[model samples]
Target: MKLFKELEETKEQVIKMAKLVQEAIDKATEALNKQNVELAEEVIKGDDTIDLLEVDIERRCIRMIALYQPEAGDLRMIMGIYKIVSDLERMGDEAENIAERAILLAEEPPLKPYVNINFMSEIVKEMVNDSVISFIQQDTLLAKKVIEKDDTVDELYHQLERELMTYVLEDPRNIKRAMHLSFVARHYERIADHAENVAEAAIYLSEG
Candidate 1:
């Protein structure tokens, strides 16, 4: 009972950490969409919060294992937390990268409506949220769903890349802004990959 109880507490902390990462992703997207320099700066500054939480959660996971020496399901859950926290922190880093790009893009004129970028962000964010949900529910089905959605994100990313390249070809003047938008697209694509990693970890946890 004590081992399971400690694992429950760890689960709560993991959920909290995931929520922070999700918040960062959402704010970064909003900053990009609105060209809000202030919000982008705020998202950048908030990365430290995620960093601290990640370290704390990792410490707690290690301490749980060392102290309880939990067996079987409990051990699997802790192991999953260790990996999931790392993925979430990396997702936070991706969010910061997106914020940086947002600040750069805000310095110039709007780059043709950002429609595809926004669309990509929506799917990536959904993958992130569902990955966390799969972790919470220990639902392999949901985890599989998250994994499946990643292909869509990749497809959308490629579409954005092609569209940006088209802009560059249309006018050499569009190169700078198109490049910045391309970087943002890549960041979202990486974020989706991280989310899929989390979902894979969830499947491992569920079956273990």
Candidate 2:
């Protein structure tokens, strides 16, 4: 009972941390979409807070293990939290990378519509949200479903790359901006990979 109680409290903290990561991804994409330097700056600055909270969450997870010596499923969940929190923190870093690129790209004119990039980010965000739900429910079915979307992200990212290549061919002036935009897409792609990691962690937690 005490272990379950502590786990519930830890889950609360995890969900809070996940929320911050999600917001970073969302706002960074929005900033990129609108070319809003100010919004990008906010997302950049928010990374410090997320990192601080991650340390606190990591400490709590370690404490739970130290105190409870939980067995089987409980132990798996706590251990998964170790990987999950790290993945979440890295996702925030990806968001920060996106935000930093957003600010840089803001210095230039629009490269394109950002349609595919936005779409990819939206899918990644959905996968992230679902991964959190699957984590809470210990739902492997949902976890597998989230894992499947990683290809969709890769496909979109590749398509965006091809489109950017055309921009470079069209004009030398587009090269720098296009490359920056390509990196932005890569960030979303990387974020999706991290989200998939969280889903994988959920599956591991469920089976154990």
Candidate 3:
């Protein structure tokens, strides 16, 4: 019973961390598109906050395992959550990476419409948020739903990068900005990959 309490509280903490990362995702993308330097600045600072929460969640999971030596599904959940926080931290890193690039891109005149990048950001953020919820609910169907978006993200990223190449070739002055543009696109892909990994963990827990 005591161990269950720990597990319950940890769920709340993980949910909190996921929301923080989601905000980071939204603000970072907005900063890039809107040229809002101040919003980007907050995303950069908030990464550390997510980092500390992840470590705290990790610490609690380890303590539960040591104290209860929980087995089977309980053991699996503890281990699964351990994996979730690690992925969550990586997603935060990607968010921070985007915020950094957003700061750099904020200086230049907005090169091209961020239509595709914005679209990619939307899919990636939804994946991250839903993956965390699915992990908590032990919902394999939800997990699988998140998994399908992996293909969608991959397609958008490749298309965006190809289009960005055209911008750079058209004018050498567009090179530097276009490079950052593509980097931001790649970061979204990396983030989706991590979120997909989290969804996989959800399926692993549910089936096991």
Better of 1 and 3 by TM-score: 3
Write the residue-wise lDDT of candidate 3 on 1-208 in tens digits.
Answer: 7888989989999999998888899999998888988999999988889999999999999999999899988898888999889899999999999999999998789889799988898998899899999999988899999999989999998998888889877888899998888889999999999999999989888887
Q: List the residue pairs that clash in candidate 3.
A: none
In order, the Cα lDDT scores of the candidates are 0.86, 0.87, 0.91
Inter-residue clash pairs, candidate 1: none
Against the true structure, whose TM-score is highest? Answer: 3
TM-score of each: 0.95, 0.95, 0.97
What's the candidate order when arranged by decreasing TM-score?
3, 2, 1
Please provide, for model 1 over 128-170, each residue's C-alpha lDDT reduced to its tens digit, 9 standing for 90 to 100: 7889879867899999998999888888888887878888778
Query: Candidate 2 — what's its lDDT?
Result: 0.87
Regions of model 1 farther than 4 Å from truth:
none
- Per-residue lDDT tens digits for candidate 2, residues 70-177, read 887777777778778888888889999999999999988887888998889889888777887788788898999999999999999888888889988889888889
